[PDB]
Amino acid sequence: GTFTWTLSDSEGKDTPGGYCLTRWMLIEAELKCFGNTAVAKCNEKHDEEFCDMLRLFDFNKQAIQRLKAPAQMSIQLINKAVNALINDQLIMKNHLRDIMCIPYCNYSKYWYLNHTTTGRTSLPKCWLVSNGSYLNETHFSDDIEQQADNMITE
Amino acid sequence: GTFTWTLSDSEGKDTPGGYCLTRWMLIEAELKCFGNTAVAKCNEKHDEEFCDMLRLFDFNKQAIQRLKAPAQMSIQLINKAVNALINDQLIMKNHLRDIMCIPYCNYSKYWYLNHTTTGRTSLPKCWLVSNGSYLNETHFSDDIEQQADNMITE
Amino acid sequence: GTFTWTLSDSEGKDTPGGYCLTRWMLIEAELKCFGNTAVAKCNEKHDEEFCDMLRLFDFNKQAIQRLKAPAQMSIQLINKAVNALINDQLIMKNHLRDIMCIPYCNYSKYWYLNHTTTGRTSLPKCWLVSNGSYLNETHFSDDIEQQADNMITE
Amino acid sequence: SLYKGVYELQTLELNMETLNMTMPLSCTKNNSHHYIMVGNETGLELTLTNTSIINHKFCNLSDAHKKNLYDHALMSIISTFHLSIPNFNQYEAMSCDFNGGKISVQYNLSHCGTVANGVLQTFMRMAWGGSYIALDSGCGNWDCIMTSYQYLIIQNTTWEDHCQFSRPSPIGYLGLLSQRTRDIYISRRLL
Amino acid sequence: SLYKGVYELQTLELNMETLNMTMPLSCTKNNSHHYIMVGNETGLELTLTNTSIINHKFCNLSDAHKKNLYDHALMSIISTFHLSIPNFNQYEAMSCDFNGGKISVQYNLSHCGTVANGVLQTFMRMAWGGSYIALDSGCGNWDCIMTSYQYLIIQNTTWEDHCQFSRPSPIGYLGLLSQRTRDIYISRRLL
Amino acid sequence: SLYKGVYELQTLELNMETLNMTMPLSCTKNNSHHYIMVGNETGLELTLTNTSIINHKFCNLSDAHKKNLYDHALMSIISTFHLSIPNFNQYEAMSCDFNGGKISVQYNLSHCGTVANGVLQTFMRMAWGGSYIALDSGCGNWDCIMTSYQYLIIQNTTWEDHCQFSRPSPIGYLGLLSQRTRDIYISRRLL
Numbered sequence A, B, C: 001g002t003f004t005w006t007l008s009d010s011e012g013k014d015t016p017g018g019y020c021l022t023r024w025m026l027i028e029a030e031l032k033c034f035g036n037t038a039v040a041k042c043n044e045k046h047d048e049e050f051c052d053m054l055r056l057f058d059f060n061k062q063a064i065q066r067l068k069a070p071a072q073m074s075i076q077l078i079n080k081a082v083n084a085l086i087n088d089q090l091i092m093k094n095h096l097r098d099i100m101c102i103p104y105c106n107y108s109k110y111w112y113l114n115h116t117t118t119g120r121t122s123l124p125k126c127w128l129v130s131n132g133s134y135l136n137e138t139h140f141s142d143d144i145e146q147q148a149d150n151m152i153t154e
Numbered sequence D, E, F: 001s002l003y004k005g006v007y008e009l010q011t012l013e014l015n016m017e018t019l020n021m022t023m024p025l026s027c028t029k030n031n032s033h034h035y036i037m038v039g040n041e042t043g044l045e046l047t048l049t050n051t052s053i054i055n056h057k058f059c060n061l062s063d064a065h066k067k068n069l070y071d072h073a074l075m076s077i078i079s080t081f082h083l084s085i086p087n088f089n090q091y092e093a094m095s096c097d098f099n100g101g102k103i104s105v106q107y108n109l110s111h112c113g114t115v116a117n118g119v120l121q122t123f124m125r126m127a128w129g130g131s132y133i134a135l136d137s138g139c140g141n142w143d144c145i146m147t148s149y150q151y152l153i154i155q156n157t158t159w160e161d162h163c164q165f166s167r168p169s170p171i172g173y174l175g176l177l178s179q180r181t182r183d184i185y186i187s188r189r190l191l
């Protein structure tokens, strides 16, 4: 009924938690690490696309790393695990927002506030699209202000 | 998966949040509004019938507003997004309580506390029914007392 | 959907909550009572095997108590109600951890901390296995230490 | 009442009739007549009676699909009903008649663990509010739920005020959407 | 762009090519050609076109299953596509040719409540990344979703740098997995 | 073990036999023999064996449904097992015999992506606890499972204490209830 896959990327770090997206995982970007305080929200939140993508990428890594691949590729593994990795109803929300001409996430682009000196970052939220055009930063500036207030509170 | 549809009724209010049930959404009643503090619980809790009903009514509103109607009615859209809107296992719990002769929620009647002077209200919880007879207030008076204590705590 | 079954207990106990595993629900054959603070986590947590098993045992108790037994054994009730009682994707996670050779939970054995004087206990967490051998305690001692910190926080 | 001096208990009653343009709304008139309204012009009347209207064992679903002529929403509801019946194995119990585009289905309900129980369970779940009166007991009996009536007849009907016992509510249908193909039996090696 | 003095807004973008070894990836080249790449060797080509390739009304699924000459991944994707069509009731509308193990499905798309509607909704949810350009209207129309093309043709194909218009994404296919057998009519009394 | 001076590490083990009256409980006797107990009276015995018992290629599920002599719980478990097999496309692999309410299913299991692999994949999930010993490799392989045994035989049996290697558990059966009809291939255009 609910996702359960846990992210295990703790080795060789300054804190037991967090998760790092490597260069191959990102488009024209270097390796990016997110701390324990931000990644730990993924255990609880149900309406975060980035957390679903983190679980998908981690499952892809673990699957290609621990399970012997077949000679010809299979699809049964994801067909089982997807309900444990992601909220398919979040995809359904985004598709519903697409058909009713509301801005929606296509799971490509994400934004986060990065503290310049300390380096602490927010949990990335998805950059919405509408008809193929990304929303300008001004379309959700109050959300960015709210996120800044949220990590000033932390 | 899990419910993901978000309630958007922020415009024309003194706080960006809450939700208002119009006179058409209520039986023998006028417009009644609930604040951000109560409605924000719906984003997290998995066992509130009223939050499911709010998502259903909001989706009905958005669907009639933002989708061209067919010539003859089709129920494809609800069959597609019901799990995005509601928790069907909450309905399963209520049916299980119905067949076990336990009081259950038939999603019709709800109750909430209302502060007399400030007007602040709690999240409406469902008035349980058993064999066609609603429970008296005395059957769950301690629940009401606990809700009042929660309101004073916040 | 999501689990919604509520644990019916607290008759005759010193607080209105918690849950007690009787002599029949345990291999050791001794009653074990857990307080309100530990069992209240089961309302929210989505990745606790003990909570799912606790809901299953409570549902078994209520089903034999309140529903008439058919002459021939039938399993329609659990077939519909399983998604309301348990997170099947938690079982999917444990199966995945098994196929990938990661230690997993087979839902048999659980461990909890217990304060020596006050008798306060944490929510039991599952004891993992790997190829028929239970993990030694030293394999997760830090996790136990972390749990102790949580018990010191509360 | 007035709790803690300052908090007054107040109540709601949701008007779910306004969900009719998006959802099927199921509710009961009396113990032998229940309805599923889809919009303001169409619906299905479920009726527990000793009077049968189909005297043959045919149920020509394929010809009806080939001809269309039926409301797609009603056929979707009928499919959700049939696929939600647990342990359906006697096909001769169900007969139907889609001639001319109408929808008419008849489940033959003629001590438990049988097909009549499976039909009645999905019946009472489909019309959740107000189906308990139709049953012999109304509570405490699930695996041997039973009614004295011999046939369940599902017929397409036009919209009228029918909820004199229970209010319109989509909850039964929305619950049964998860039940589809969940407790059916295999009839082939390849489904 | 600094917020509250010291919090800098920064941007991230995910590369879902790397998920190809574990799951499919759906993406679009232009308004007609769309692709479902399984691995780095095989995939499906979903083409909206007025040119028909199959003239007959057969889809010999049973013979294809018995011979077992096809890619199991691609046939699984085809099954997920067909079972996700809402209210499919015209068996003649879909033709196939699996001779030699290939996959070549043809949906005949030649208003609301039609085969073209269900096929096009499942086509969009299968190719959700960039299939919105395949319509007369991008959004605001779901039930009456009509494209000027008369046929949707699904053919097995090899891997190339296909999708110029949208990036690879498993989200459409992963979304359609829960929709399988969810809104499908009953053709026989025993499924 | 005393942690931080005042907290003692203690353990409990759940007795799942008490769940027998509400749900099936699966357990392993040894490498070949596994069991799914229903109630305190009935169950299924799943044996991996070199020896066949059916020896023909008929599976008359429809006639078994007509006669209605079988146990409904056991037949529902058989349906849950079979509908959970991914990519089953060889009807000849499965043979059945339902004479007089009996249940006797045989899977033929004769290197990756074959019917034997799918049947064994579902077999390790039907009886999750302690079925790893049956495979040559306990873990690290999911898509290319083999067993030296040549047949999987499911037969109805009476209750007896078989849980020698693993304890009773509903977790496998309860896990596979969501697996049903999720990786099945289409055999008809109107299912």
Ligand SMILES: *[C@@H]1O[C@H](CO)[C@@H](O[C@@H]2O[C@H](CO)[C@@H](O[C@@H]3O[C@H](CO[C@H]4O[C@H](CO)[C@@H](O)[C@H](O)[C@@H]4O)[C@@H](O)[C@H](O[C@H]4O[C@H](CO)[C@@H](O)[C@H](O)[C@@H]4O[C@H]4O[C@H](CO)[C@@H](O)[C@H](O)[C@@H]4O)[C@@H]3O)[C@H](O)[C@H]2NC(C)=O)[C@H](O)[C@H]1NC(C)=O
Pocket (backbone or CB within 6 Å): A106, A107, A108, A129, A131, A132, A133, A134, E128, E129, E130, E161, E162, E163, E164, E165, E166, E167, E168, E169
């Ligand atoms: C979510 O929503 C966003 C916004 O709606 C959407 O973003 C768009 O993604 C697509 C797909 O990546 C982007 O399309 C790419 O755009 C670049 C740049 O285009 C301009 O500049 C090039 C310069 O060469 C011009 O030719 C072009 O006309 C434009 O002016 C293109 O370079 C990309 O084409 C290359 O990649 C394709 C896919 O790999 C190939 O099919 C194509 O042949 C090209 O490959 C060639 O160049 C490669 C260079 O690395 C080379 O490696 C190859 O071998 C080959 O030589 C492509 O058209 C589009 O611009 C994005 N738009 C925005 C606003 O960001 C996401 O697609 C969407 N995501 C999902 C998952 O739905």
Ligand SMILES: *[C@@H]1O[C@H](CO)[C@@H](O[C@@H]2O[C@H](CO)[C@@H](O[C@@H]3O[C@H](CO)[C@@H](O)[C@H](O[C@H]4O[C@H](CO)[C@@H](O)[C@H](O)[C@@H]4O[C@H]4O[C@H](CO)[C@@H](O)[C@H](O)[C@@H]4O)[C@@H]3O)[C@H](O)[C@H]2NC(C)=O)[C@H](O)[C@H]1NC(C)=O
Pocket (backbone or CB within 6 Å): C106, C107, C108, C129, C132, C133, C134, F128, F129, F130, F161, F162, F163, F164, F165, F166, F167, F168, F169
């Ligand atoms: C989860 O993982 C753990 C760890 O891998 C598993 O724990 C093992 O479970 C097995 C099976 O229970 C257990 O083996 C038992 O050991 C006992 C001591 O040797 C045996 O007595 C027992 O056999 C008896 O019980 C069976 C079941 O009742 C009978 O079929 C059998 O004939 C034997 O009967 C004797 O005992 C019964 C009472 O049980 C009594 O009534 C009879 O008269 C007779 O005296 C098993 O061989 C291992 O010891 C466990 N190992 C550990 C480390 O705990 C656990 O099974 C897994 N659980 C699941 C659900 O997967």
Ligand SMILES: *[C@@H]1O[C@H](CO)[C@@H](O[C@@H]2O[C@H](CO)[C@@H](O[C@@H]3O[C@H](CO)[C@@H](O)[C@H](O[C@H]4O[C@H](CO)[C@@H](O)[C@H](O)[C@@H]4O)[C@@H]3O)[C@H](O)[C@H]2NC(C)=O)[C@H](O)[C@H]1NC(C)=O
Pocket (backbone or CB within 6 Å): B106, B107, B108, B109, B129, B131, B132, B133, B134, D128, D129, D130, D161, D162, D163, D164, D165, D166, D167, D168, D169
């Ligand atoms: C949930 O539980 C409650 C209590 O069990 C239940 O409330 C009942 O709802 C029914 C249906 O509306 C009520 O029946 C009405 O009673 C009044 C009595 O004055 C009648 O006038 C009504 O009849 C008129 O309206 C009907 C519908 O429009 C017409 O068909 C009819 O011809 C009349 O014009 C109607 O009979 C019943 O009184 C209440 N009871 C209580 C205690 O409130 C409710 O139905 C359940 N809801 C759901 C969604 O299941």
Ligand SMILES: *[C@@H]1O[C@H](CO[C@@H]2O[C@@H](C)[C@@H](O)[C@@H](O)[C@@H]2O)[C@@H](O[C@@H]2O[C@H](CO)[C@@H](O[C@@H]3O[C@H](CO)[C@@H](O)[C@H](O)[C@@H]3O)[C@H](O)[C@H]2NC(C)=O)[C@H](O)[C@H]1NC(C)=O
Pocket (backbone or CB within 6 Å): F058, F059, F060, F061, F062, F063
């Ligand atoms: C299952 O078994 C039935 C028959 O059942 C067997 O015989 C009964 C008399 C009882 O003793 C049962 O216990 C016993 O198992 C098979 O029925 C057969 O179906 C086929 C079609 O699939 C029939 O062939 C058709 O026959 C009609 C004329 O009757 C022709 O017009 C058709 O063109 C076609 O030839 C066959 O006659 C029929 N036989 C009987 C005895 O009814 C059924 O096929 C079988 N199913 C499986 C899956 O094995």
Ligand SMILES: *[C@@H]1O[C@H](CO)[C@@H](O[C@@H]2O[C@H](CO)[C@@H](O[C@@H]3O[C@H](CO)[C@@H](O)[C@H](O)[C@@H]3O)[C@H](O)[C@H]2NC(C)=O)[C@H](O)[C@H]1NC(C)=O
Pocket (backbone or CB within 6 Å): B024, B064, D017, D018, D019, D020, D021, D039, D040
């Ligand atoms: C089915 O549902 C629709 C609502 O989704 C119902 O129509 C709604 O009816 C109410 C009146 O009861 C309309 O509200 C009012 O309309 C008047 C004008 O008629 C206006 O002056 C008021 O300010 C208010 O807007 C509402 O607009 C209307 N909505 C729609 C979408 O039609 C309909 O009555 C229901 N039918 C059945 C059979 O239940």
Ligand SMILES: *[C@@H]1O[C@H](CO)[C@@H](O[C@@H]2O[C@H](CO)[C@@H](O[C@@H]3O[C@H](CO)[C@@H](O)[C@H](O)[C@@H]3O)[C@H](O)[C@H]2NC(C)=O)[C@H](O)[C@H]1NC(C)=O
Pocket (backbone or CB within 6 Å): D029, D030, D031, D032, D033
């Ligand atoms: C439950 O409610 C239904 C509908 O209100 C009742 O069925 C109705 O019964 C009346 C009286 O028998 C029928 O009226 C008769 O109709 C015929 C044909 O139009 C007419 O020739 C007679 O003169 C008379 O008017 C009515 O048509 C019928 N409606 C339906 C929907 O069947 C039913 O009797 C009620 N049952 C119980 C248990 O209260």
Ligand SMILES: *[C@@H]1O[C@H](CO)[C@@H](O[C@@H]2O[C@H](CO)[C@@H](O[C@@H]3O[C@H](CO)[C@@H](O)[C@H](O)[C@@H]3O)[C@H](O)[C@H]2NC(C)=O)[C@H](O)[C@H]1NC(C)=O
Pocket (backbone or CB within 6 Å): D052, D054, D055, D056, D108, D109, D110
């Ligand atoms: C719905 O199911 C019931 C029960 O099966 C059907 O009624 C049954 O009909 C059969 C066939 O007529 C009856 O058997 C008959 O018995 C008489 C002697 O009593 C014999 O002369 C006939 O040749 C035949 O063998 C059976 O007794 C009867 N049972 C009941 C409960 O009525 C009913 O016909 C079915 N209805 C439909 C619409 O299919």
Ligand SMILES: *[C@@H]1O[C@H](CO)[C@@H](O[C@@H]2O[C@H](CO)[C@@H](O)[C@H](O)[C@H]2NC(C)=O)[C@H](O)[C@H]1NC(C)=O
Pocket (backbone or CB within 6 Å): D099, D100, D101, D102, D103, D156, D157, D158
């Ligand atoms: C059930 O549906 C049928 C078929 O749609 C309805 O009968 C049709 O009614 C329309 C009304 O305009 C006529 O034009 C058609 O010719 C009728 N069809 C047939 C085959 O007679 C029927 O009225 C509906 N039943 C009820 C009780 O309303």
Ligand SMILES: *[C@@H]1O[C@H](CO)[C@@H](O[C@@H]2O[C@H](CO)[C@@H](O)[C@H](O)[C@H]2NC(C)=O)[C@H](O)[C@H]1NC(C)=O
Pocket (backbone or CB within 6 Å): A024, A064, E017, E018, E019, E020, E021, E039, E040
């Ligand atoms: C499919 O995904 C795999 C796994 O991520 C990709 O393989 C990587 O390819 C890059 C670029 O050549 C290498 O630097 C990595 O080391 C590879 N990783 C592994 C685990 O092999 C592969 O590129 C993807 N396929 C396609 C066609 O894009």
Ligand SMILES: *[C@@H]1O[C@H](CO)[C@@H](O[C@@H]2O[C@H](CO)[C@@H](O)[C@H](O)[C@H]2NC(C)=O)[C@H](O)[C@H]1NC(C)=O
Pocket (backbone or CB within 6 Å): E052, E054, E055, E056, E108, E110
């Ligand atoms: C796809 O469907 C169309 C529409 O039914 C078919 O075109 C029809 O073909 C028949 C052949 O007898 C003609 O009489 C009709 O006039 C045609 N209708 C239209 C609108 O063109 C077409 O044959 C089908 N295509 C395939 C490949 O089966």
Ligand SMILES: *[C@@H]1O[C@H](CO)[C@@H](O[C@@H]2O[C@H](CO)[C@@H](O)[C@H](O)[C@H]2NC(C)=O)[C@H](O)[C@H]1NC(C)=O
Pocket (backbone or CB within 6 Å): E099, E100, E101, E102, E103, E156, E157, E158
């Ligand atoms: C679609 O699949 C078919 C069947 O696999 C492909 O045709 C096969 O190509 C291989 C190439 O090694 C040959 O060995 C087989 O003999 C071919 N089979 C037949 C029946 O011709 C076909 O190439 C694929 N289509 C595309 C566009 O790639």
Ligand SMILES: *[C@@H]1O[C@H](CO)[C@@H](O[C@@H]2O[C@H](CO)[C@@H](O)[C@H](O)[C@H]2NC(C)=O)[C@H](O)[C@H]1NC(C)=O
Pocket (backbone or CB within 6 Å): C024, C064, F017, F018, F019, F020, F021, F039, F040
């Ligand atoms: C199946 O479960 C039932 C119910 O938990 C068990 O019956 C209990 O058995 C104990 C020990 O003999 C009795 O003291 C209880 O009174 C019984 N409870 C009830 C409600 O009848 C039964 O032992 C289990 N059966 C098997 C074969 O394991």
Ligand SMILES: *[C@@H]1O[C@H](CO)[C@@H](O[C@@H]2O[C@H](CO)[C@@H](O)[C@H](O)[C@H]2NC(C)=O)[C@H](O)[C@H]1NC(C)=O
Pocket (backbone or CB within 6 Å): F029, F030, F031, F032, F033
């Ligand atoms: C697992 O245990 C079963 C049950 O005891 C064994 O099957 C028995 O094998 C003996 C061998 O002499 C036969 O005489 C019995 O008839 C068999 N019983 C049944 C019910 O089939 C089986 O051999 C054991 N398997 C392993 C691998 O040790």
Ligand SMILES: *[C@@H]1O[C@H](CO)[C@@H](O[C@@H]2O[C@H](CO)[C@@H](O)[C@H](O)[C@H]2NC(C)=O)[C@H](O)[C@H]1NC(C)=O
Pocket (backbone or CB within 6 Å): F052, F054, F055, F056, F108, F109, F110
């Ligand atoms: C299980 O399937 C195998 C493989 O098809 C069957 O063994 C084949 O039997 C045929 C017919 O006698 C022989 O021509 C083949 O040579 C056999 N193949 C192999 C690999 O040995 C086996 O008979 C089947 N079992 C049952 C009970 O039907």
Ligand SMILES: *[C@@H]1O[C@H](CO)[C@@H](O[C@@H]2O[C@H](CO)[C@@H](O)[C@H](O)[C@H]2NC(C)=O)[C@H](O)[C@H]1NC(C)=O
Pocket (backbone or CB within 6 Å): F050, F147, F148, F149, F150
């Ligand atoms: C009977 O079962 C055995 C295992 O008990 C099967 O195992 C084969 O054992 C031989 C021994 O020489 C090996 O060469 C084979 O590779 C094993 N087979 C497999 C599939 O691993 C044996 O095949 C069965 N015998 C039959 C059907 O005659």
Ligand SMILES: *[C@@H]1O[C@H](CO)[C@@H](O[C@@H]2O[C@H](CO)[C@@H](O)[C@H](O)[C@H]2NC(C)=O)[C@H](O)[C@H]1NC(C)=O
Pocket (backbone or CB within 6 Å): F099, F100, F101, F102, F103, F156, F157, F158
């Ligand atoms: C499998 O089921 C069959 C059919 O129910 C069992 O055979 C029946 O056994 C009962 C007693 O339990 C007898 O009264 C019936 O007459 C038998 N029926 C037939 C048709 O022979 C059979 O015993 C079961 N198998 C096992 C191994 O327990």
